[model samples]
Target: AVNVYSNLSRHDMLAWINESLQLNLTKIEQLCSGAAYCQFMDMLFPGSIALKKVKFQAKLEHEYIQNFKILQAGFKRMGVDKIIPVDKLVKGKFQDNFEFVQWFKKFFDANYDGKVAAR
Candidate 1:
């Protein structure tokens, strides 16, 4: 049930993310780091992004924002009509991060070619 407006929980979001990406994560808010989102978008349109610019496992606020810049650039380049709630998400809030991740799942289901991702 991709993109269905139904009972999509954080659990399902986490499941979908881990299942699709080569990331091992435990919390939805961890996506606030912006690393996984970079990889996710790149997977949606390969070479539309540069993985080397992404900073994985980011902890501090500035580090999070840096990865977000890379992610924001990807979204713009791909013409995806999505806005990143940069300030809120970089603070590591679960609610906002989960919602963004949910939005990504919709984009992913519609665009991903089921190709294996880079690590």
Candidate 2:
């Protein structure tokens, strides 16, 4: 049982996604494609079951749907109900209790790049 909601403009979400790419692409690229990547998605979007039910698209883009093609498929395999696109999610207003944001703030502020640093 997880809660789902969207709050943030497309531009804002896109910008954040791009910044995350720039900051994390190095590590993300190293993850082996398949289950590893899917597990990673679970951590990234912890409060959602939607990711567990979509097909992975083979388009590499730094934005929204394109950014998580593999994860999308992984979600589907896991029998998730639905996968919400970042573009659409961004169109809504913020609702308190989005754990991802709070986690993101700490991670963003820290200098750890998913490497041998930060405890």
TM-score of every prediction relative to native: 0.85, 0.30
> What tens-digit string does per-residue lDDT give for candidate 1 at 27-94?
99888888888887787778878987787757889999999888878777777657678999998888
- Evaluated with lDDT, which candidate comes out highest? 1
* Cα lDDT, all candidates: 0.78, 0.36
Clashing pairs in 2: 51-75, 52-75, 52-76, 53-75, 53-76, 54-73, 54-76, 56-73
Clashing pairs in 1: none
Candidate 1: regions farther than 4 A off: 1-7
lDDT of 2 by residue, 20-114 (tens): 44323222222222223333445444533244442233232343344345555544554543443444323322332132333333433432234
Instruction: Identify the runs in model 2 with alpha carbons over 4 angstroms from their true place.
Output: 1-6, 23-69, 77-79, 83-119
Highest TM-score against the true fold, candidate:
1
